């Protein structure tokens, strides 16, 4: 009347008064990563690996006016501004994303983290007249 696994975990159950089979899945138990600035008023919540369709009705009952899904879970109290990159950032999240604070809605901005670039020059690549074209100091 019970289903187990390779290493001591109950993943099934059969009832003897109803003749029905069920499957056991563990409850949610996770933490939240919140970024807080120096003298801000409310941190920027980040529920990793959780869609906001599940957070706004099963985890947090507080009315959150700002929410949007991302690659590492939906971020609360932030704006979707991934089209803007920064060089240095003190609040690093991962996967090439960070959150910066701008003194003013939601002051926290969800931006991209690109610490290194390359120097571009307006020169030709193919040989012109058998000669190249480079910059000499």
């Amino acid at each position: 009347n019970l289903l187990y696994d390779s290493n001591g975990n109950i993943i099934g159950f059969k009832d003897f008064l109803t003749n029905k089979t069920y499957t056991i899945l563990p409850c949610y138990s996770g933490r939240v990563s919140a970024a807080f600035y120096q003298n801000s008023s409310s941190p920027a919540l980040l529920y990793r690996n959780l869609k906001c369709s599940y957070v706004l009705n099963n985890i947090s009952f507080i009315s959150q006016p700002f929410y949007f899904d991302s690659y590492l879970g939906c971020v609360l109290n932030a704006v979707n501004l991934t089209s803007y990159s920064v060089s240095s950032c003190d609040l690093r999240m991962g996967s090439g994303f960070c959150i910066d604070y701008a003194l003013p809605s939601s002051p926290y901005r969800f931006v991209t983290f690109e610490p290194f670039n390359v120097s571009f020059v307006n020169d030709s690549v193919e040989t012109v007249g058998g000669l190249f074209e480079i910059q000499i100091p």
């Binding site: 696994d5 290493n7 001591g8 975990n9 993943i11 499957t23 563990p26 409850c27 949610y28 138990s29 996770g30 933490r31 990793r48 690996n49 959780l50 869609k51 599940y54 690659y71 590492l72 879970g73 690093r92 999240m93 991962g94 996967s95 090439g96 983290f113 690109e114 610490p115 290194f116 670039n117 390359v118 120097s119 571009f120 020059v121 307006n122 020169d123 030709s124 690549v125 190249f132 074209e133 480079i134 910059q135």
Partner: protein, 430 residues
């Protein structure tokens, strides 16, 4: 007499998956009666969190260092590879380049890196794709979902694999088109000729066998690309690291089912069957056992992070002194005769491609370390030997048999000759 070019791959581990453990979710319970007793141990779980954070900080620092070493002193042109000819001088480099134009976004991996990334499941994106399925409906059983709900979760690095692949494919085209940053301003074929000239091969044979060098490079790249279908050493090491991490994460979880001298492993049964004033002993036994397990785990992590840092420093040194510039140190970047080196992005590390100088045929000939000229003057060869052809002294290279007349550009002059030098008064300046 004849020569070819051979390839060789090498993998150096640089990064490690970052593991985080919860203070109270794993030690005692989701309950509160157990937490009321854990407070007597003081800040014991806070010291555990004061180690993984430092490990992750060191990993981020060394990853930033690798990125800086890859992107230091690199300048490209505006008219970049916008579906342009990725091959230069009959050398196909398309198999190891991504895309750097205005289009082709959200994907910058090369065809060579795809073969490595499609043979590993627990990559950077693997944990992200396997963790978000524990809510929307996963399989019947999954180990990562069970470990996540108990306080064990792997965090992604601060830089995605796409950015590292982009840095690599941008540093690769550096020594391919003007300006040549990784070649000190020397074109690719001229750079290869200068590299192979230092071994002893004369310039007369290099200009007549350029197509041979191109075909050798193409065949080496094809053999390196096709060598991933079998079981290589780099993939073996990557799979070994992944399996070791998975085994450690699975063994850390099994500590919650041990008895540790108590009456039952489940904490709810102790509180639902025995009276309060006698459950403290069992709770203390379980707490001590699990804290000892966590201490052993963090000690193993601190022991492994040192070797991780050592390997990362080795990889940084190799990237700095083998591909972006040539260092006059033999037996460092390869095995003896070394010409060039290339870097590719690999899961949890980097992949290097080494090109060497492998002879094919040999010939036995009589050589002389030096001869004495007329007037007690001496002369010794440099990067070569002295041979006799038709009763005449000439010069030959140390890595290729090609006689050439003796000149002041291939020998050195001496004010006195040794007693074990062959006499030769017939040669004055020839």
């Amino acid at each position: 007499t004849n020569f070819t070019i051979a390839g060789h791959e090498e993998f150096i581990q640089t990064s490690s998956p970052k593991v985080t453990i919860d203070c109270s979710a794993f030690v005692c319970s989701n309950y509160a009666a157990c937490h009321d007793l854990l407070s007597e141990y003081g800040t014991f779980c806070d010291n555990i969190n004061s180690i993984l954070n430092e490990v992750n900080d060191l990993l981020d620092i060394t990853q930033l260092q690798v990125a800086n070493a890859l992107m230091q002193g690199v300048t490209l042109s505006s008219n970049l590879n916008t579906n342009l000819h990725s091959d230069v001088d009959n050398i196909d480099f398309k198999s190891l380049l991504g895309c750097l134009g205005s289009q082709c976004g959200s994907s910058s991996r090369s065809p060579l890196e795809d073969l490595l990334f499609n043979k590993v499941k627990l990559s950077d994106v693997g944990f992200v794709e396997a963790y978000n399925n524990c809510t929307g409906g996963s399989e019947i059983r999954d180990l990562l979902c069970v470990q996540s709900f108990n306080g064990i979760k792997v965090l992604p690095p601060i830089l995605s694999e796409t950015q590292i692949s982009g840095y690599t494919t941008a540093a690769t085209v550096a020594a391919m088109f003007p300006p040549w940053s990784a070649a000190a301003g020397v074109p690719f074929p001229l750079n290869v000729q200068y590299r192979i000239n230092g071994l002893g091969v004369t310039m007369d044979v290099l200009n007549k066998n350029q197509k041979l060098i191109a075909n050798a490079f193409n065949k080496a790249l094809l053999s390196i690309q096709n060598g991933f279908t079998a079981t290589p050493s780099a993939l073996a090491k990557i799979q070994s690291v992944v399996n070791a991490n998975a085994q450690a994460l699975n063994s850390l979880l099994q500590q919650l089912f041990n008895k540790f001298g108590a009456i039952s492993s489940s904490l709810q049964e102790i509180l639902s069957r025995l009276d309060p004033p006698e459950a403290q002993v069992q709770i203390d036994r379980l707490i001590n056992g699990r804290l000892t397990a966590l201490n052993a785990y963090v000690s193993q992590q601190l022991s492994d992070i040192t070797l991780i840092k050592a390997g990362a420093s080795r990889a940084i040194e190799k990237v700095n002194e083998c591909v972006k510039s040539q260092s006059p140190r033999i037996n460092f970047c390869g095995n003896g005769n070394h010409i060039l080196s290339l870097v590719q992005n690999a899961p949890y590390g980097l992949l290097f491609i080494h090109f060497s100088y492998k002879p094919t045929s040999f010939k036995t000939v009589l050589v002389s370390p030096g001869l004495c000229l007329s007037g007690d003057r001496g002369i010794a060869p440099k990067q070569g030997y002295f041979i006799k052809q038709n009763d005449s002294w000439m010069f030959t290279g140390s890595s290729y048999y090609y006689p050439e007349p003796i000149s002041d550009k291939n020998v050195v002059f001496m004010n006195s000759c040794s007693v074990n030098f062959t006499k030769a008064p017939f040669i004055y300046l020839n």
